[PDB]
Every structure is written in C-alpha cells, then in structure tokens.
Design an enzyme around this catalytic site. Structure first.
Site, PDB file in Angstrom:
ATOM      1  N   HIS A  13      -7.242  20.071  -2.106  1.00 62.50           N
ATOM      2  CA  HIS A  13      -6.872  20.199  -3.505  1.00 62.50           C
ATOM      3  C   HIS A  13      -6.488  21.621  -3.858  1.00 62.50           C
ATOM      4  CE1 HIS A  13     -11.103  21.531  -3.742  1.00 62.50           C
ATOM      5  NE2 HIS A  13     -10.620  22.323  -4.685  1.00 62.50           N
ATOM      6  N   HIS A  23      -3.972  28.469  -4.707  1.00 63.72           N
ATOM      7  CA  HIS A  23      -4.129  28.283  -3.259  1.00 63.72           C
ATOM      8  C   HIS A  23      -4.732  26.903  -2.937  1.00 63.72           C
ATOM      9  CE1 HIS A  23      -8.169  29.162  -4.543  1.00 63.72           C
ATOM     10  NE2 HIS A  23      -8.594  28.692  -3.383  1.00 63.72           N
TER      11      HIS A  23
END
Ligand SMILES: Nc1ncnc2c1ncn2[C@@H]1O[C@H](CO)[C@@H](O)[C@H]1OP(=O)(O)O
Length: 210
Positions: free
Chosen positions: A62, A141
C-alpha cells in the site's frame, strides 16, 4: 465514529505481485553488485538483503496518505472530513513508481503522485523537518522491507532524506546499470535505482482498520 488506522492506496493482487517481485530482484542485484559489496562497511562474505530486510508486508502493498490512529493523530479528523477523501473512498487509481531504494533501515519504492492524487495527500500543521524544500507528496512511497529494529514509518523519512540529497545535486554519477535502470550511491548506506520505465500500479483508495 472512529477513523481508520490510516488511509491510502492499496495495490491490487497483480500489482502488489509485480512491485514485490521487482523490489526483491533489486535486492538480489544490489547485494550482488560490486559497488555495494565495496561500501558494505558504511552499510553494516556477502550480505543477503532479502534476509536483511526481514520485516516485509505479508500481503498486499500500500501507499499511505494519512496515518490516523483512529482519530488520535494530529489532523486526522481534518483529513477524513475532506470532500475529496470521502468522494475518493473506494475509487481506483494508477500510481507511478519512479525509483526503488535501499538504506541500512528500509527498502521502498518512490511513488510520484498525479495532481488528482495530490488532492488526497494530507496538508498537516506538524510537518517533517526533512520534508521542507520538497514539493508536497515527495514522502509518497511503498514500503518493501525493514530491518529488525525499524518501524515502517522510517521508509518515508528515508525517502525524504534521499531526495533532500538529489535536490542538492549530491547523488553523483550512476555507479552501475541494473537491467531496469541506473544505480546511484548516495553514501551513508543509501542506494537509489532510477527506473527507465516507471512502473504503473493499480490501487484502491480506502481505509485500513488494523
Ligand atoms: N507515526 C507515523 N506517521 C505516519 N505514518 C505512520 C506512522 N506510524 C506508522 N505509520 C504507517 O502505518 C502503518 C502501520 O501499519 C505503516 O505501514 C506506516 O506506513 P508506511 O509503510 O507508509 O511507512
């Protein structure tokens, strides 16, 4: 009503598979690279990085927007109440990964957000001291692994630090060519791969409740 643990883009089965596979090839390749083996003292026979980064996401990958801690985090209520977040909730997105990276602490993939996706990036009052000087959303990120002592939080901080060097023109010339891109050595155990082709990953924006 309590908010989720955090909001973010959760990558599909197939896309999590692609990125995970791609992050893990980087790790075998970086660990096998002459340039890395030489600087191993500034990092910690050869070190197996897939093992070094033992703490991995066990399922779907995720990309976090806003850590909420169910409403205990500063600015959580604020964030969740935004029209854009409620409207976007459960919607599909394509994320662009520009780079994979490694530090003595974390291994991650750098996400570059479209302006539409940036509408979902938080605008908190308490901001990181390494964040400044970089556009909002630079922290974006996907975490691929961490060392034993490290919280997955560190990955975002690791990424900002790395880009604080790039904007300073402190990356230097590339020290190698991996099949997917040019390999850079930032020093202090840090390593960045700039991908030739940015990989597009599919993801759903939703909330994760622990
Ligand atoms: N203090 C913090 N600030 C922002 N995000 C945090 C945080 N502590 C934990 N997290 C995020 O919450 C998740 C915990 O299950 C981690 O994946 C981490 O996301 P990350 O992977 O983007 O770094």
């Amino acid at each position: 009503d309590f908010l989720p643990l955090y909001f973010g883009w959760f990558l599909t089965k197939k896309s999590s598979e692609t990125l995970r596979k791609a992050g893990q090839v980087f790790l075998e390749e970086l660990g096998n690279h002459k340039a890395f083996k030489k600087e191993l003292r500034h990092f910690i026979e050869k070190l197996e990085l897939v093992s070094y980064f033992g703490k991995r996401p066990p399922g779907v990958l995720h990309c976090t927007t806003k850590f909420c801690d169910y409403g205990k985090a500063a600015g959580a209520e604020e964030y969740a109440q935004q029209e854009v977040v409620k409207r976007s909730y459960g919607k599909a997105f394509k994320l662009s990964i520009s780079a994979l990276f490694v530090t003595p602490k974390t291994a991650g993939a750098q996400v570059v957000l479209t302006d539409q996706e940036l509408q979902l990036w938080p605008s908190d009052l308490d901001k990181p001291s390494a964040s400044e000087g970089l556009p909002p959303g630079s922290r974006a990120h996907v975490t691929l692994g961490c060392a034993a002592d490290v919280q997955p939080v560190q990955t975002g901080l690791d990424l900002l630090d790395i880009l604080q060097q790039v904007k300073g023109g402190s990356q230097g010339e590339a020290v190698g060519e991996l099949p997917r891109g040019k390999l850079y050595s930032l020093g202090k155990g840090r390593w960045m791969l700039s991908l030739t082709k940015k990989m597009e990953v599919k993801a759903i924006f939703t909330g994760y409740y622990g």
